[PDB]
């Protein structure tokens, strides 16, 4: 019997800062126990200061990103070159995904950018289109390894202030772009060590009011 789905591995990570947002993802592409590519870009600039990644089955991932990029193009044509806000993009993606509710895009989608107040924004989707704005989200193969670390080191969960013994929580102070990139790199270094489908390279896209910047880092190739 023909199986229309496959698993291309990989892992992605979105973090929303105070006036910035990052969307990271490893560059390894796989099937079963073989490496297809050590550098296959997974996070894409879609225009209008929005970055996107659809992790899971790469064919469905590429199809979805391609169709969203297309939706941005036609949004400009149909509405006098109006900038597609991140919240509007998110709702649009829900309809793209739910449109194939009974033959789903087998992907975990994450977009990142800035909201209309200039603050950092990350949105997260399931394969059939349910979505929610989030401060933090890891997706894909090693998501289970990364999310708990982010609950602890981004939202200061289960952390309290010394001397008070559980009475006073650690205050939720804001994180700089340099601080976030440190947490992203350590997340992927750790994920690479314990997950076989994570490695080769890490590509991070950073979104600010100035535009979209890229950073690349080597990961272990075993």
């Amino acid at each position: 019997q023909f199986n229309p789905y496959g698993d291309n591995g990989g892992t992605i990570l979105g973090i929303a800062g105070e006036d910035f947002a990052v969307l990271a993802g490893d560059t390894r592409n796989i099937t079963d126990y073989s490496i297809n590519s050590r550098y296959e870009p997974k996070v894409f600039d879609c225009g209008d200061n929005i970055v996107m990644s659809a992790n899971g089955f790469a064919a469905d991932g590429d199809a979805l990103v391609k169709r969203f990029k297309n939706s941005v193009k036609w949004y400009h044509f149909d509405h006098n070159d109006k900038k597609l806000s991140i919240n509007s993009a998110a709702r649009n993606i829900q309809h793209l995904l739910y449109g194939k509710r009974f033959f789903p895009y087998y992907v975990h989608t994450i977009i990142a950018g800035l909201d209309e107040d200039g603050k950092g924004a990350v949105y997260s989707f399931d394969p059939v289109g349910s979505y929610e704005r989030e401060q933090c989200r890891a997706g894909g193969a090693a998501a289970s390894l990364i999310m708990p670390f982010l609950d602890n080191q981004v939202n200061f969960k289960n952390q309290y202030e010394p001397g008070t013994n559980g009475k006073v929580k650690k205050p939720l102070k804001y994180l700089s772009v340099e601080e976030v990139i440190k947490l992203v790199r350590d997340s992927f270094t750790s994920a690479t060590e314990r997950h076989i489908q994570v490695g080769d390279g890490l590509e991070i896209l950073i979104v600010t009011k100035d535009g979209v910047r890229k950073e690349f880092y080597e990961l272990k190739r075993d």
Binding site: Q1, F2, P4, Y5, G6, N8, N29, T31, S34, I35, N36, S37, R38, Y39, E40, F57, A58, A59, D62, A63, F103
Partner: protein
């Protein structure tokens, strides 16, 4: 949904400093029966692209006709069909990739794994993969089926990352490909000794080599091997 009947095995390929090399054996298998011994699985498109195909041969022949038809269609009302508006490797690939994914989405796939090797207008090397699922990826070395498991490891020792491409000559690259084909003949039970090889260079163009054979094989050591353990005679 179907099953593949007459099938072709590994297609292997890699980038080098001035272009790309691609190769595939000339066998059309019918299960374990090595039925057809003269099947060409590298199909050139113009003088700048070679499409290597593995998997179902009936579907390969269909794809071959689509590409032939693509050249005809591009020539229509196109005074620059042999110049600025000639078919690019990137155009040919994206077309195939579109078809492969559309067919899988109708639950009626073209049961193949395809590698499009070529050189672009600006001299850039093109090498990208697509299969029955519509999955696509690019890499300095690409291989299908058994080639993925056995050829890639050997070809990645020559070009391990992007920066190794300018350091790799056509002689070193071809040598690596020819060696990989020998290894696949040792170890793939659905391979043949006879194969075809294609080089697409940005300077010397398309060189298509037919009727190549695996040579310099090591078998002599077999004479010393006796029994499966304790047997001496």
């Amino acid at each position: 949904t179907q099953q593949p009947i007459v099938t072709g095995t590994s297609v292997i390929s890699m980038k080098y400093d001035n272009g790309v090399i691609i190769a595939a054996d000339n066998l059309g298998s019918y299960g374990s029966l090595l039925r057809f011994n003269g099947v060409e699985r590298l199909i050139p498109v113009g003088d700048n692209t070679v499409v290597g195909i593995s998997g179902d041969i009936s579907d390969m022949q269909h794809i071959e006709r689509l590409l032939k038809d693509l050249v005809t269609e591009n020539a229509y009302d196109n005074p620059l069909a042999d110049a600025e508006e000639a078919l690019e490797p990137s155009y040919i690939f994206e077309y195939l990739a579109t078809v492969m994914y559309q067919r899988r989405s109708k639950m009626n796939p073209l049961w193949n794994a395809i590698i499009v090797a070529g050189v672009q207008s600006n001299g850039d090397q093109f090498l990208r993969y697509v299969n029955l699922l519509g999955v696509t990826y690019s890499s300095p070395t690409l291989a299908t089926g058994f080639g993925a498991h056995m050829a890639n490891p050997l070809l990645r020792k020559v070009v391990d990352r992007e920066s190794d491409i300018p350091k790799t000559t056509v002689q070193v690259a071809e040598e690596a490909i020819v060696n990989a084909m020998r290894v696949l003949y040792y170890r793939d039970a659905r391979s043949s000794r006879n194969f075809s090889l294609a080089i697409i260079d940005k300077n010397t163009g398309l060189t298509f080599k037919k009727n190549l054979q695996v040579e310099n094989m090591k078998w002599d050591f077999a004479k010393d091997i006796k029994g499966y353990g304790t047997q001496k005679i």
